[PDB]
């Protein structure tokens, strides 16, 4: 039993996409999550993962809609930031 991080295993394209892959041994450019909206969406998945199984179907849906609304508000802020960057 050894870690996949230590072995030089290539990333494989699955239903979950690989995306753009950064080269090994070079600068993996840091993206910051200082924004409160970007802080809320990460917080929604942490609280959802720890809570686990809920018997209620409605409360199970509200646990997912909180994550969905957090993603939408963050995306609107990022698009407004992208528009402000395009103006500048």
């Amino acid at each position: 039993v050894y870690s996949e991080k230590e072995l030089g295993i290539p990333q494989l394209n699955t239903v979950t996409p690989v995306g753009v892959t950064k080269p090994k041994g070079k600068k993996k450019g840091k993206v910051f999550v200082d924004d409160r909206e970007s802080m809320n969406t990460i917080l929604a998945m942490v609280e959802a993962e720890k809570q686990g199984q809920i018997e209620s179907k409605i409360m199970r849906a509200r646990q997912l809609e909180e994550i969905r609304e957090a993603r939408r508000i963050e995306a609107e802020k990022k698009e407004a930031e992208r528009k402000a960057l395009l103006e500048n």
């Binding site: 290539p10 494989l12 394209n13 892959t21 950064k22 600068k27």
Partner: protein, 251 residues
């Protein structure tokens, strides 16, 4: 409109992907891989080898298809692939060898099912007139028309055709994007490898005048027949040796 196409210029193409009776499991796997490539493709079951070859045209009219990809198998070992426009167009017969399907765990590449590929052709495809006919039949069969409702909206794989020997080598590759060092493309092989040996090109649909003949094709059955003739020739040389040696002893 019932073409399942949303485009300003509609390139209406339907391909009928069809297998013969005596195909192998490897031949069936290659059909399964190529049919997953084609959103405008319909799979078809075992075709009677005792039927007539132009009954494929009556078959493709029924399924409303203007292209036929026919997998014809001989002796339970060999594969022949046919490409044809259905009513009147040209028809080419290949001999398919060196098959490696998607299930082989040495490829490491994957792509979207039904996405529109980039067709990589070779310079020899535009020089030789018979390779120009094959290229257009390859562009019709593996086209994946632009506004097709069963297609996928992003591009992640390239289908390549290469003329190296007197044969056509077919490869798939995955467009993998890598961030540039202060984006670039890497290719990872996905799917089917198969070598096509052009045997004949017909003017009719599955029969008609012959426009091109290979005249260099060594069939698999000619290799088998040469081995059996060599086995019998070895035995006959033994009998002629014994007949000569007995005649020498009687002298």
């Amino acid at each position: 409109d019932r073409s399942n196409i949303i485009a300003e210029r509609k390139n209406k193409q339907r391909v009928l992907v069809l297998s013969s009776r005596g195909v192998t499991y490897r031949h069936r796997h290659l059909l399964n891989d190529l049919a997953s490539m084609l959103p405008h493709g319909r799979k078809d079951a075992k075709f009677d080898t005792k039927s007539r070859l132009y009954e494929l045209c009556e078959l493709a009219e029924l399924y409303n298809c203007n292209n036929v990809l026919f997998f014809e198998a001989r002796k339970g070992k060999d594969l022949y692939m046919w490409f044809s426009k259905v009513p009147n167009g040209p028809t080419v017969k290949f001999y398919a060898q060196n098959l490696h399907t998607m299930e082989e765990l040495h490829f490491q590449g994957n792509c979207l099912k039904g996405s529109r590929p980039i067709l990589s052709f070779d310079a020899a495809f535009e020089q030789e007139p018979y390779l120009k006919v094959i290229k257009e039949l390859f562009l019709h069969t593996f086209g994946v028309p632009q506004g097709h409702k069963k297609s996928k909206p992003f591009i992640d794989h390239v289908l390549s055709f290469s003329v190296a020997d007197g044969k056509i080598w077919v490869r798939n590759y995955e467009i993998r994007e890598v961030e540039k060092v202060k984006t670039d493309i890497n290719l990872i092989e996905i799917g089917p490898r198969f070598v096509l040996t052009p045997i004949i090109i017909q003017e009719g649909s599955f029969g008609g005048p012959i426009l091109y003949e290979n005249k260099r094709f060594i069939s698999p059955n000619k290799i088998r027949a040469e081995l059996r003739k060599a086995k019998a020739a070895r035995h006959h040389a033994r009998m002629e040796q014994q007949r000569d040696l007995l005649a020498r002893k009687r002298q």
